[PDB]
Design a protein around this nucleic acid. Structure first.
Lengths: 104, 98, 94, 79, 95, 103, 104, 79
DNA sequence: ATCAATATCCACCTGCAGATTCTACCAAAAGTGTATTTGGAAACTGCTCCATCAAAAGGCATGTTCAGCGGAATTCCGCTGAACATGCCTTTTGATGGAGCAGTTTCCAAATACACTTTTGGTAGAATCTGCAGGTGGATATTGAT
DNA sequence: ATCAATATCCACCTGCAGATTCTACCAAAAGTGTATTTGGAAACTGCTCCATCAAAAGGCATGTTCAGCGGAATTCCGCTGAACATGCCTTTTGATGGAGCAGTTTCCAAATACACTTTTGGTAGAATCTGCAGGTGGATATTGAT
């Protein structure tokens, strides 16, 4: 498989197919699906890594939506890339404006 | 009797809801609202249950975030109580009142 | 009938970074939307790039500039790093 | 009216998650009006995709596409 | 010099139809040219997606129509749809 | 006989058809698409020129300049919304002073 | 000597209002041309060396930059007024960019 | 240090066009900082298009496409 | 500072909804091998417009003085939201026909596709044209002191 | 109210940059006419899964009461707007050398186009498995009165 030659877990052939059927251009080079597949895989690895940690920090072994939200909002770069995206069932980061805290 | 002071329970609620992810509006009432509005665009429609859920997830995230900006606007005016004028300012600056 | 998704591939990557961690259905669905969303964003910017330059072909060079345009700093750096690595490895192979 | 089904307690909960400590009484009706405009905009678009596909059932994808158009991308129900 | 086209002569014609004695500066015309191109892109883009979402390989007038409805607000959409339908119907009546 | 003629339009059906193909928006483009699309574009152009021409008339001018285009679009609820994220070079802004600022 | 009548002096706010009316009526660029050009050149240079600029490219940047700042002052102005002030401060600009999604 | 060419009077004028009657002394430096970020983001993208095309000259179109990417569509310079 | 009414937390336990391993299945991919075609790079270079220097002049920026008035701190009242507990009506949950989403197959109107005949939107450019920018002087406010 | 210091509206005037221009070349586009391929509307249909109805869970509607927040009123000082003098540097108008953008013909590495064979990802009814939600007990931190 093309993914094997590229050393990827993501489906190079599928990515190629989706690029063609997406009407992005008249033609698609051979390397584009490989490059794109690799990027998709890396971004996936990046989020699963942070979400997994989020799960471990909650004494849990299965990643749920809340963990993906925590991973993204707590990371400057991912939060920006996903700045106009809503993660269903992710809730929000704990945060209370200081002025609303009880006057010590 | 025991009686917590004003703000203590509210602060407690903020900590509780910022901790969970569950939807905060009840299903049926919301579902009724969606269908009512939809009826004005096309009659005799049906909805996949996942469609109503998508709409509820989207609407709540939207209100919660607007609430966040609304809070910032009240605090900007040196208040700690949100008012209609705060929601309005947040919406106008967001371009929703463009 | 069928219905494709990136689920098995997300899972494979999941085991590479956290062999002991599982992922729920809803969480996997979020991951699927994420991959699809980024694919569309990148392909979309690559498409415009070629059209702007009166080119009829989307090559890895369009994907790379699109990535530079769409991802924040470091994310962009590593993504470019990974992309170039996969093309190199792909070419140097029968 | 159904919009009143969106109760004071439910609106209060949304505010709490949004980090709000004190809420003015006029906030409830104001919030309902905003939720109504929000839903009208998204539902209008979703139904438009529904009609275009010649269906009588609003699908999750119709909502996801409407949300995307309004710049409110939602992950979890498809695309 | 590979000729670069614009909608300038068509904007001009339309201008003469609504304001026979009114002219337009080249800057104003340049803005009108960006306006036409921008709406062309938005509508075509929306029609493109619409076709894809439904597994259709052809963009027909029906796609442009839904696209116009998703894109333009209220009254503009109604009038646009009307003129669009009108032109297609007339186009079909001939030959 | 041009397709624009057959459809009763001033905007170019032929060009629009061509532009729809090179934009690679879909595998194929049906014959009624360009007609309909050219019609819409012509209508929106007529709508903004009508209002801009009026704005020029109100400023005792005969030549529409960018400022008139901006006055026409910002004073019209729908054109304002359709072009809500758009910047018209040399258009300035609408005169508008918040009340508390007046003496 | 006849001096019982002081030199004419407009009150604070009168000329500022005269200014808002004048600038809202015209459309010319308000930032000096050459200085703005040097800024574009400096910033571009720190990104990539040996770049040239079509002059219409510099002008496009200036039309975009001024419409962006003018509109930001509008929101800033509504933020000051919201605080019951009539003087814009750094905190108003900041609140406006925050709600706009430009910083949080 | 060309950011100082954006003078106090130029900034005041821009504020007036924006309907501002009173300006605090700290606004000038804050505005220069905001303009600098705005320009960096736009120029950054504009120069990326220039390089993708293998040119050494930033064109008006490079800026127009950069502006469009950032949701700041500009009319009057080619689209 | 001293209880005391409650909220919060941690360790442990377990049923079960949702996750997982399984043998099976096949249309749809995805990969391989071959022949045809073509996008766009390399080399040459016509010609655009970008960087730069020159010189004069004024409209704008800089820097200062000065004091009106707006921002901010303090005080304090009374209007209103937060906490609460009494009481039940709407929402949630689980079960069942039927609407319509979706899979399969027929086939006609409609869209590619290659060939040429013809019309036309750019444009180089020439010429003559013409709306209005910008200087002006005078009639009408608009301000601010008293 | 009355009036003096300025700012503002403004129609008339007219040369000048920017617009409307037209003789004419034209490569490119857009249109006419078969010939060939095919997308997707239709009609029939099986079965998910959606709307509906009965029933059991449990959150919301209510009125009372007062803590504490919003904002009116007063006050003080320091900052920012108005006016002014000085002269710098932006603007304007040309000229010019040549960087580099953009047109043109050449030509092949790479891509589309089927044809053919192996493989895999999705679906599924079946069986087994398991992370953790949620309920219990008991410790101890938090809050609010005294």
């Amino acid at each position: 498989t093309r993914s094997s030659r590229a050393g990827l877990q993501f489906p190079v052939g599928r990515v190629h197919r989706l690029l063609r059927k997406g009407n992005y251009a008249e033609r698609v080079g051979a390397g584009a699906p490989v490059y794109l597949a690799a990027v998709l895989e890396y971004l996936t690895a990046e989020i699963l890594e942070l979400a997994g940690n989020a799960a471990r920090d909650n004494k849990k072994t299965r990643i749920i939506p809340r963990h993906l939200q925590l991973a993204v909002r707590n990371d400057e770069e991912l939060n920006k890339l996903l700045g106009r995206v809503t993660i269903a069932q992710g809730g929000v980061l704990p945060n209370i404006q200081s002025v609303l805290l009880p006057k010590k | 009797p025991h009686r917590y002071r004003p703000g203590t329970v509210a602060l407690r609620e903020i900590r509780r809801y910022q901790k969970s992810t569950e939807l905060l509006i009840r299903k049926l009432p919301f579902q009724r609202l969606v269908r009512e509005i939809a009826q004005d665009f096309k009659t005799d429609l049906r909805f996949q249950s996942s469609a109503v859920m998508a709409l509820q997830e989207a609407s709540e995230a939207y209100l919660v975030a607007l609430f966040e900006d609304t809070n910032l606007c009240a605090i900007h005016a040196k208040r700690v109580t949100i008012m209609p004028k705060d929601i309005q300012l947040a919406r106008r600056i967001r371009g929703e009142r463009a | 009938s069928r219905k494709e998704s990136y689920a098995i591939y997300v899972y494979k990557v999941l085991k590479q970074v956290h062999p002991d961690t599982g992922i729920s259905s809803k969480a996997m669905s979020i991951m699927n939307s994420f991959v699809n969303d980024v694919f569309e964003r990148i392909a979309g910017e690559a498409s415009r790039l070629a059209h702007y330059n009166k080119r009829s072909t989307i090559t890895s060079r369009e994907i790379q500039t699109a990535v530079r345009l769409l991802l924040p700093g470091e994310l962009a750096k590593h993504a470019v790093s990974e992309g170039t690595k996969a093309v190199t490895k792909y070419t140097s192979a029968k | 009216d159904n919009i009143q089904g969106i109760t004071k307690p439910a609106i209060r909960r949304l505010a709490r998650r949004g980090g709000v400590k004190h809420i003015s009484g006029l906030i409830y009706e104001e919030t309902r009006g905003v939720l109504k405009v929000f839903l009208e905009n998204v539902i209008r678009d979703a139904v438009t995709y529904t009609e275009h596909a010649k269906r009588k059932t609003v699908t999750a994808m119709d909502v996801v596409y409407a949300l995307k158009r309004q710049g409110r991308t939602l992950y979890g129900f498809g695309g």
